[PDB]
């Protein structure tokens, strides 16, 4: 029904994966640190209400007739829907408010990768809010109302809707398929794996940036699939690209989805072989991405793909080595990375008096 | 997760309970071969029978010849039917092909220009449409993708629109959904149980003049942008006055409950409900079946938001046109703009397993 908002960690990372996403990047328009802090406090108060299924402020109706309602009202009658709201800070935020020396070293700028075709308008951003819920209207309402509360101090830079499974009809334990028709998420860090999260996802105090202890680092990549090209490939070609079969999702030479892969049986440039921790010095990621389908482009092709989200303890030892290793991935023929952003996701809101970013702003 | 029967005197997807998600595609025809088009309609019908029962198209998604592309693209494997309906319509432009000129229904009227229109011609019209509705977005995208694939070389996608959530109701026993302005939308519609009202207002009859269309309907689609910045600064009273219903309960002004009958004289003369009500339009009544959308940001710092308005009626000339003409003075016009338009003739149902989409026309 609901996911607790308070914790040592922000929710929406290790908590169960909800069916829908609305991810928004924002740019900050104010130069006034005090004004920004005030906004973070107001947003935290709103997030507390939103995640409990309550309207922001004094509500969506029943206030002064001559005043705009505090909540825009489109989630009235809906359930909390496991809403989580996760905030992150982009590198560009640290050029404001005297913060330059508090940028974490683990918040690294990404290199240019072969085949990148990044749209600058759907890249970057000073901050992000990841809204995940089982009902997309609950997520959209959250973003719309945060944006409204922030008007005059922040603007929306770019926005992405996404979907995974539909939980009402699909068992929780079934791996979702991506839009290439392959199971996606078999070998991942699970939110149950507390030690793996400590090793590979959460920032530790000894890593170098005390304010980020209990936070994580997020890489977002908007990855278009060339759907119509992929659908013309043979079944063999598709399986060869991944190193798993399409029906069961077993590694080649194995029988079951969850059988551990034998990498040498896969083609050298198969995706799974290149991305596996054993191929990358042990580098391991929490993937928490969502499929997207935005419509059709000017050529009549499906604008669809994977809005890839990865959480890690350090960008330099998580996404960067793994993505570097995908330079020769057979999958590259059928995908293009068209948007990118990185964010430092701070620690959790500890209790009712705490607020997003309090460890940074003080 | 249940299936909706595909066969019937009417196509499903009209009077059917409104499903959570939409994927609407308009296609243009690129073949001049009548036989080839008929063959496509039959292949599409066969595919639709599989898709709406939760089965893969053709010989399946895997287990075929390794050297051939799979017949089904595979991303719906393991998913329930999810109330998928597939509804086909034919646009006016179709009737310039295949010797069909004389068979264009009079009720398939071109819309006049309405004040305030700003129609994008690229995202308007279309020789044909497929409306895919389901409770699972993946199921809906799969259906459209596989239809388009089957149609390669004979049809191209002209434009598409995804709807993330419904803003309509054919089931008054169930909660009425809210649009992105925060109001309940669908209270006074036509219910799927109201057989007499469907015959009067929605289904084409033989006596209407076009025998091939008996049991079909006519569809108007309007893509409507919402000026949410403008709306969100309006007072509660202004918002409620725009509609003639309160925001919280959605009761007619003065009254206590949603489903109490409107008393039109208590509404402002330019209130939406007052101008749209059948009693204000010589009895004209529509079946509204639209969905909300958001397609990113608008590039000016704000979320994009709108409503993909769909209405079914027995005759465009006696349904949508009178009512929209009467909305020329609507208070709602301050907050919306129509930016895409199409009309379609939705043929009768597929009677049984030997029938096919468009068989009464061809
Ligand atoms: C559209 C783009 C992509 C698609 C369709 C895709 C698909 C898949 C699939 C089907 C699997 C196998 C099942 C599983 O274990 O999840 C997989 C595994 C994986 N992918 Fe990707 N992927 C994409 C992009 C990326 C990117 C950008 C990265 C990282 C930079 C990445 C990292 C991984 C990792 C780490 C694994 C697990 C390997 C293992 O430990 O076995 N993927 N992906
Ligand atoms: C973004 C655009 C629109 C919004 C936000 C909107 C909103 C609403 C709302 C809140 C209601 C009251 C509840 C209900 O009975 O459904 C309503 C009713 C209605 N609307 Fe709209 N509407 C829009 C566009 C249109 C258009 C374009 C038409 C027709 C051309 C239309 C026709 C109707 C009708 C027929 C009713 C029911 C009136 C009655 O019989 O009581 N609407 N609309």
Segments making up each domain of chain B, as ranges: 21-173+199-346
Residues 6+ apart with CB under 8 A from B247: A60, A61, A69, A73, B182, B183, B236, B239, B240
Q: Residue A28 is encoded by which pair of tokens?
A: 């900050």
User: Cβ(A235)–Cβ(A182) under 8 Å?
Assistant: no
B23/A231 Cβ within 8 A = no
CB-side neighbour CA atoms (13 Å) of B69: 16
Q: Tell me which DSSP letter residue A283 carries.
A: -
Q: Residue B185 is encoded by which pair of tokens?
A: 């939308």
| Torsion sign (Cα): A166, A167, A170, A172 | positive
**β-strand partners of B311:** B220, B288
User: Cβ(A198)–Cβ(A8) under 8 Å?
Assistant: no
The residue written with tokens 């959460």 in the block is A202
Q: Looking at beta carbons, which residues of chain B come within 8 Å of A163?
A: 137-138
Rounded to an integer, what distance in angstroms lies between the CA atom of residue B343 and that of residue B336? 20
- Among candidates A343, A285, A337, A275, which has minimal Cα distance to A112? A337
What is A9-72 written as a DSSP string? S-SSSSSPPPSEEEEEEEEE----HHHHHHHHHHHHHHHHHHHTTPPSTT-SSSS-TTS--SS-
The binding site of B for heme b comprises 186-188, 272, 288, 309
Q: Residue A320 is encoded by which pair of tokens?
A: 């960067």
| Torsion sign (Cα): B346, B347, B351, B354 | negative
Rounded to an integer, what distance in angstroms lies between the CA atom of residue B61 and that of residue B30? 27
CA A73 centroid distance within chain: 26
Distance of residue A119 Cα from the nearest chain B Cα, in angstroms = 13
CA of A272 to the centre of ligand 1 (A): 6
**β-strand partners of B10:** none
Distance of residue A174 Cα from the nearest chain B Cα, in angstroms = 9
User: Cβ(A218)–Cβ(A309) under 8 Å?
Assistant: yes
**β-strand partners of B287:** B312
Q: Nearest residue of B to residue A154 by CA position?
A: B301
Please indicate whether residue B308, judged by its CB atom, sits closer than 6 Å to ligand 2: no
- Among candidates A191, A224, A218, which has minimal Cα distance to A291? A224
Rounded to an integer, what distance in angstroms lies between the CA atom of residue A146 and that of residue A158? 14
Rounded to an integer, what distance in angstroms lies between the CA atom of residue A282 and that of residue A248? 26
Name the maximum alpha-carbon separation found in chain B: 70
Q: Where are the alpha helices (DSSP H) in chain B?
A: 34-51, 137-150, 195-201, 228-232, 236-243, 272-276, 320-326
Please indicate whether residue B278, judged by its CB atom, sits closer than 6 Å to ligand 2: yes
Instruction: Decide the pairing of beta strands A154-163 and A20-28.
Output: antiparallel
Q: Residue B58 is encoded by which pair of tokens?
A: 């053709």
What is B122-180 written as a DSSP string? GGS--SEEEEEEESSHHHHHHHHHHHHHHTTTTEEEEEEEEESEE---S-TTSPPPB-T
User: Cβ(A21)–Cβ(A132) under 8 Å?
Assistant: yes
- Among candidates A198, A133, A129, A203, which has minimal Cα distance to A159? A129
Q: Nearest residue of A to residue B159 by CA position?
A: A296
A360 sits in which H/E element: helix A358-361
Residues 6+ apart with CB under 8 A from A179: A225, A227, A291, A293, A304, A305, A306, B75, B138, B141
**Residues with beta carbon inside 6 Å of ligand 1?**
A 178, 180, 182-188, 221, 223, 225, 242, 244, 261, 271-272, 275-277, 285, 305-306, 308, 319, 322-323, 326, 335
Rounded to an integer, what distance in angstroms lies between the CA atom of residue B27 and that of residue A213? 53
- Among candidates A178, A198, A357, which has minimal Cα distance to A286? A198
Compute the C-alpha angle B5/A183/A190, nearest 5°.
120
The residue written with tokens 């799979």 in the block is B70
User: Cβ(A12)–Cβ(A286) under 8 Å?
Assistant: no
Rounded to an integer, what distance in angstroms lies between the CA atom of residue B195 and that of residue A20? 36
Rounded to an integer, what distance in angstroms lies between the CA atom of residue B46 and that of residue B89? 17
CA of B103 to the centre of ligand 1 (A): 52
The residue written with tokens 């800070």 in the block is A89
Method: X-ray
CA A149 centroid distance within chain: 22
Q: Tell me which DSSP letter residue A183 carries.
A: B
């Amino acid at each position: 029904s609901a996911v607790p908002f308070h914790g040592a960690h922000q929710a929406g990372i290790a908590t169960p994966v909800q069916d829908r996403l609305h991810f928004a990047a924002f740019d900050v328009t104010t130069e006034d640190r005090a004004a920004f802090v005030a906004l973070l406090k107001e947003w935290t108060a709103a997030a507390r209400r939103l995640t409990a299924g309550h309207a922001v402020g004094e509500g969506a109706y029943g206030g002064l007739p001559e005043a705009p309602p505090d909540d825009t009202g489109e989630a009235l009658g809906l359930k909390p829907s496991r809403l989580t709201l996760t905030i992150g800070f982009g590198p560009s935020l640290f050029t404001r408010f005297g913060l330059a020396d508090l940028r974490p070293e683990a918040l690294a700028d990404l290199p240019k990768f072969p085949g990148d075709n990044l749209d600058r308008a759907r890249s970057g951003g000073d901050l992000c809010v990841q809204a995940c819920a089982d009902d997309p209207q609950v997520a959209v309402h959250a973003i719309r109302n945060l944006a409204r509360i922030g008007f005059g101090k922040v603007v929306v830079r770019w926005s992405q809707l996404g979907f995974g499974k539909t939980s009402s009809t699909t068992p929780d334990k079934q791996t979702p398929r991506n839009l290439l028709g392959f199971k996606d998420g078999t070998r991942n860090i699970a939110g149950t794996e507390k030690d793996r999260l400590d090793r590979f996802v959460w920032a530790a105090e000894k890593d170098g940036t005390p304010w980020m202890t209990g936070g994580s680092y997020l890489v977002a990549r908007r990855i278009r699939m060339h759907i119509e090209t992929w659908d013309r490939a043979s079944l063999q070609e598709q399986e060869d690209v991944f190193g798993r079969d399409k029906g069961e999702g077993a590694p080649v030479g194995k029988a079951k989805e969850r059988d551990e892969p034998f990498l040498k049986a896969m083609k050298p440039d198969a995706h799974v072989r290149l991305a596996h921790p054993d191929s990358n010095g042990g580098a391991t990621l929490l993937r928490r991405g969502y499929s997207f389908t935005d419509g059709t482009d000017g050529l009549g092709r499906l604008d669809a793909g994977l809005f890839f989200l990865a959480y890690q303890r350090d960008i330099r030892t998580g996404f960067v080595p793994v993505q570097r290793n995908l330079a020769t991935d057979a999958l590259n023929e059928f995908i293009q990375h068209v948007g990118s952003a990185v964010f430092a996701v701070p620690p959790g809101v500890r209790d009712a008096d705490d607020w997003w970013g309090s460890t940074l702003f003080g």
